[PDB]
Symmetry: C5
Subunit: 365 residues, 5 copies
């Protein structure tokens, strides 16, 4: 739409036209100012192991790795939208990779008793994001700064997939999550684009595996998790799990996500306020929106963008953004009432997202 | 059945779960609380993370009992719905892993009783762990913990055999009948899995606890026994008795059937025109749920174990409505839990198939 | 007594008749339930170095040793009142002795810089109580569990008395308190009753010494303290000091305490409310009750019991107990407004106290 | 000549201090705050005691800037009143001592950048320290710190000469023109004391910062430069520009005179019938004093440096009255400081004799 | 003599204590506060326990001054009532023991000045300790601390003799006349006990402090002197002057008699129809008791030392009533202490026999 809805900073048409116009909207620029502007307390102020920005937002330790990654994913799309901001996006992605390696980000791995080395085995929730971030950094910048580490981590991931009886890698020992795997497989596509390798060949077996006990094909929704030791699949379907997984799979096998997307919307998406708004139920057998981790609507905003669904994108942003009370003060964006974890991260990402397939094809600098 | 005010499901519905091979929607919503949300759900991972217990303000000393009572409920879920048996098995694997984390047993070292929580005494911890090793193996058929199970069972057997009294202490010189009842039940479960006769020690135990440790006329156990002095604390305890009679009912049904009616006459107050009941913790008071505040919750478990639907209904009418349950996004929460171990013990009482039925759990499907 | 005064749990007559009836009053039983009943948080739950019960009452670290001792003194009288509770009293005294040895109880000695070993020398405020507790444990139980430690500590006390130029032992270096010595000398009488020794022979020289510069004979009151290095006697008389000292001396030399008791009462005791109540001034030259450490009235309740003064006992308990708002919930005693440190301890002790002389003569089990 | 509402002294009185060879009574009361009360005054002792900064709630990262800006004010006090020169010398000795305390530079180690705060990078710290070594020696004539001054000056010179860009980074890969301006000014002060030519590197620096780091039309520097990417953050910064133009004016007056009018057009909002002014931090906003909230305070310093009495008066009318100054027992306090570094930067702006005049400070 | 409103005892009653050989009931109640309650009274034990100071919220840096001022009062109690001399002796033994506890001197190490608080400098601590060693021995006749007294006296003598200025610094490069006055008085007390001539250094000190460190017309000392710069802080200080004149009166009575009237004209404000007085801390203010807030309390001590009953009465009428004294169970408490060291300095002023009379204390 071309009318600016109440409480919105920019029209859905304006977000979707950023790449064609080769310019980010003023509110996306103001988000980049929040990310970059103020000495010491802006999240992308320095490469150092300083986390003041996350302390001030009250980001739980366990969520910092996801905040960095989702910022990195948005920055990669900024590089594609405006050539003039590509160097800034490159710089922020360098900081994102540096910070991602700080102990504060991965310390949960050691503290839970799972090991002293966060990449050695398992922990795909951390090293999948890191591996995708190594790739996106190199696609944006053309820099080999992290290539040695990228080559190493890609091979650890490939070897661990090849050694497992199920297709993919666990997070915690004996905890398999389709959304964390989707990140790891996408990281192999990005490595292959940079290097001419075939690590992505493992994707087919993965897409076959997740379509057995891990999906409800009729509802177009993934079960919460799989636990190889017992073979248990948790018997609840998850909207945020499905929205995130379908978004990233759309970059590797578009037809897979196109098949399930309509069913996903029928299963979880509630349209309300005379068609102006939408909100997403987290699981089946409830009328409640945004239960569980409270991210169903925010990840569905990303999925709508990935699938080019302007009507659902507009409805979700009308639900999410106005109540959060955005303001631009000194050309910098802030939300008075962020409604969820990872709020400014996922709204930023959804506003700029060029598609995972378009990031794979990023032309060089 | 009529659904009483503030109740989620009828007593008829709870008692029919096993026959219908399905848990009630509120039991399913409790399993969602236990399993659903990343990082903060109690059964999210095997790791030594206790966020779920931090959020409920569980005292450190109570974490081991929370895990155990959840494990006991999960074992009945496995028996009720074969479709949830693999999930119950997975949760019990996590329960055993978490039970071994230092945060659970650290009180043993901090009180100055020793660095090894299994070596001797501390039956309050290792009794639960040993019963959980057994129930995990009954539900799953997995030998993951069998080496540790074989070891712990023999430490327990040896310590019983070496003591001049029948059983094992908690703290040095503190003997509790309820903590022993867990340890003896663990021997029955090991025997069912292995064809051994560790349970043969049970007769001598039942004889011992019926001397100075029970008031047979009131059907009630004294608080504790202290071998050094031979002192028995002169107060009878309802929560002690309800828990002990529930677990003994699985080993010697006649023992618990003998005392159950006297127990109810001694402690149970029926009120609100017969619709409700609440349990006095000791003699010589009108006050309900004194002491640790668990008399009513453990009596709800005993009522379920004894198949007493009328008392079960009365106790749940007392316990659940004021705690203000709600189901949000298919997950159960209580706004005002009335006691420690509240969601744990209401979960357990709602699903409990009987300790004898858990002993006889048929093996899993392939 | 016969009439139950307002806010009282039991008549004075009922407290004084406990031994004759061979039963504690229901409120004494409810105090024993507070002491024994609830898992982990009751003070006599376990032998371990756990002090939850004292944390919950906000007992200052320095006072924990006195709380344990005064509970132990009450438990010894319970053993004498009801043979059926003697085993329970024995068990609680075993716990009292175990806890008394925990570093949390004596840590003040090291932290003040006075030494790493709390029994080696001085510190009679700690080791006097411990030595009396060793003895009372053995009188109640017949157990030799602590006899090796009892034999050792008794000899350290005897040797330190014999080596000092003044009769007795200091607390802090150069701080002499008659009340702390009275505990040490009583411990020697208890050791002698158990062992047939004559350590108590040192008592006569002590009673001679304290009647010189340490007492005001006209007022029947002890000065606060004596300081051997300077020879200074603090020029203030102390009611709590005197009440405690006269109570324990009455068990060793009844005539000494009988001589001073009437003058003590004239000096410090204020009868009020038409003869129904009494409250005790802590020092001379004031109208104010219960100044200083605020224990004058509570220790005088103990002295009244020791001296068999039912009228003063009744008046003091009418002053102390009603405002503290006792209630019995689930057969366990609690005070909403304890008026002082060591409140439930000293009210328990005064209610059961059979006399220090009667504890010395406790028949075996 | 007329004292504006809520002001302690006229703009005329501040500008006349050096001619009259006396600080205004409120500047004297600021020096009393800095020196008077046992233990809690910021210049009480050389020791690594930071009570004064704890009481003002100074963030750890800002203590180094508070010390430096106090030191810069003390150097002008020395030039204004010969009778206070010995006191200014003493305070500058304490400023240098405290600047070396771990509490001041600990951020360098804790961020993971290294154990030695002088060795390389970190120009935000060692540029201020090097300028403070110089100003101490100019005021006092003392060689107390000369060995350290000679060493630090050579580290700075060598690091400039080794870099492919003109200057030195703060954090690794973070280049700030304002932090460099301090380092280069420190080389001019070392040269004045020693007859050396370290300042020769300034020309190449002024050429470099006029390429990608400035918008010449708006007279405004970009936030920062990042050598690894070559990225320049695409936002202009008023506090960055005001501080940089103030210090550059002492090295190349023409540079700052060229950009100053464009700077004012870009950022300065005159209000209240011409009586007041407040400074926007960046482009595309109406909001004053965004970001670190120091645009107006640094512009007060720039106005003083450029001899702009009208803008100085307007900014002080905006900054000082709402902060509610009072003098109690001849000591200045602000009830409502409007920013970090508030009493520091108002002190400095009130006394500032010009960076060029500090370079030419005659001996005692 | 009429008892003024809110007062515990008349000025006549305080001044008559020595003649009557009895402390007033309120001084006895202060001694009860100091000695009575187990564990929490300041003079309960020799141990390194500071509960009494925790309960009064005494800042760590002030504990050494609280102990010393209590000790100075206790020495006068010994002189007033022979019956309390042994109690005063006992309290002074505790004062010396506590003064040596790390909690009292830890600021020296934590500021980075050294691990040994007596070795050099730090006259603010070791001056008080040395005077306390002497007063303990005068009151008691005990040699308990003489070995340490002989040692510390020689460290002080040697450090004076090695310095180019007359006296010893506190913090490195911080010279305070009030802290020196304590050190020099300690040498007079050592000489009285031992027949030595350490006090011979006093004349050169009195000559030195009368140059740049005093305004002789106003009878007021400057805040501090800083040997490295030679700077004298340009503010005069009433509490600095009152304390220094009080202790100097014991060594050179004429010195303090010359400046006392000028001191009063400079700083003392008489108010409430002549019934009250309050002391301005510095020049160029109407505000009373600025800075550390002790001008009026130290002037109460100076009035007592100089035998000025009219000023003593006026100051105590200002200080004591608003602090709301009460005596509960024969022990003194103040609901609203108006300053640091409140009960300490009011106790000392009420008993103070004069520093000269303490020097001449006859043996037991």
């Amino acid at each position: 739409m071309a009318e600016l809805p109440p409480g919105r900073l920019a029209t859905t048409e304006d977000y979707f036209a950023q790449q064609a116009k080769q310019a980010v909207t003023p509110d996306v620029m103001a988000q980049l100012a929040y990310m970059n502007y103020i000495d010491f307390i802006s999240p992308f102020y320095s490469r150092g192991c300083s986390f003041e920005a996350w302390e001030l937002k009250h980001t739980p330790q366990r969520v910092i790795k996801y905040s960095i990654a989702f910022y990195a994913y948005g920055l990669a799309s900024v590089a594609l939208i405006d050539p003039k901001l590509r160097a800034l996006a490159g710089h922020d992605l360098d900081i994102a990779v540096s910070k991602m390696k700080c102990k504060r980000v991965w310390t949960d791995w050691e503290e839970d008793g799972f090991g002293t080395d966060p990449i050695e085995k398992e922990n795909i929730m951390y090293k999948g994001h890191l591996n995708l971030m190594y790739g996106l950094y190199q696609l944006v910048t053309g820099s080999r700064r992290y290539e040695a580490e990228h080559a190493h981590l890609t091979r650890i991931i490939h070897d661990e997939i090849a050694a497992n009886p199920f297709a993919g890698i666990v997070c915690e020992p004996d905890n398999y999550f389709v959304q964390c795997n989707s990140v790891a497989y996408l990281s192999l596509w990005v490595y292959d684009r940079l290097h001419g390798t075939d690590y992505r060949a493992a994707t087919r077996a993965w897409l076959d595996f997740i379509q057995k006990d891990l999906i409800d094909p009729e509802r177009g929704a993934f079960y919460l998790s799989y636990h190889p030791e017992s073979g248990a699949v948790k018997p609840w379907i998850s909207a945020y799990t499905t929205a995130w997984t379908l978004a990233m799979v759309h970059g590797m096998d578009p037809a897979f996500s196109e098949r399930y997307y309509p069913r996903f919307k029928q299963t979880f998406v509630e349209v309300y306020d005379e068609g102006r708004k939408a909100r997403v139920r987290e699981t089946a057998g409830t009328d409640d929106a945004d239960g569980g981790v409270g991210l169903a609507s925010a990840f569905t905003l990303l999925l709508a963008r990935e699938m080019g669904d302007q009507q659902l994108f507009d409805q979700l942003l009308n639900h999410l953004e106005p109540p959060a009370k955005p303001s631009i003060v000194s050309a910098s964006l802030r939300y008075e009432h962020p409604g969820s974890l990872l709020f400014d991260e996922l709204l930023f990402l959804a506003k700029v997202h060029a598609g995972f397939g378009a990031l794979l094809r990023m032309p060089p600098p």
